[PDB]
A = this chain, B = another copy of it.
Amino acid sequence: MAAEPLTELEESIETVVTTFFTFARQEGRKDSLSVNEFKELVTQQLPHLLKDVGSLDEKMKSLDVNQDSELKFNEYWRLIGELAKEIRKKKDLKIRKK
């Protein structure tokens, strides 16, 4: 596990919050990106299948409302949550589609 008093449950978050630092050329790192931008990027980051169940819709419609705005940690979070809901890793994830 990690080295603050660093459990892997915590680490997952630490990783996410720092990972925002890498995305694109930007005015440093705010919190997250613009809404649609996020959705147009992460699909590229997760090239597993994008099988896209009703939670794709659940999310997409949310982006459709006011994509223009800027995402913050939680907002990004629940969206990637939904994404994990959609692309159901199952077990044979890194196998990649076999």
Contacts and interface: CB of A to CB of B under 8 A. Distances in A.
Q: How large is the interface on A (under 10, 10 to 19, 20 to 34, 35 or more residues)?
A: 35 or more
Q: Say how many copies of this protein the assembly contains.
A: 2
A13 B78 CA distance: 12
Interface string A1-27: 011111111111111111100100000
A12 to B, nearest CB: 5
A51 interface: no
Given A7-B44, A18-B93, A74-B78, 17 more contacts: A5-B47, A5-B48, A7-B45, A9-B42, A9-B45, A10-B46, A11-B15, A13-B80, A14-B93, A16-B84, A55-B74, A73-B85, A75-B81, A77-B77, A78-B81, A78-B82, A81-B81
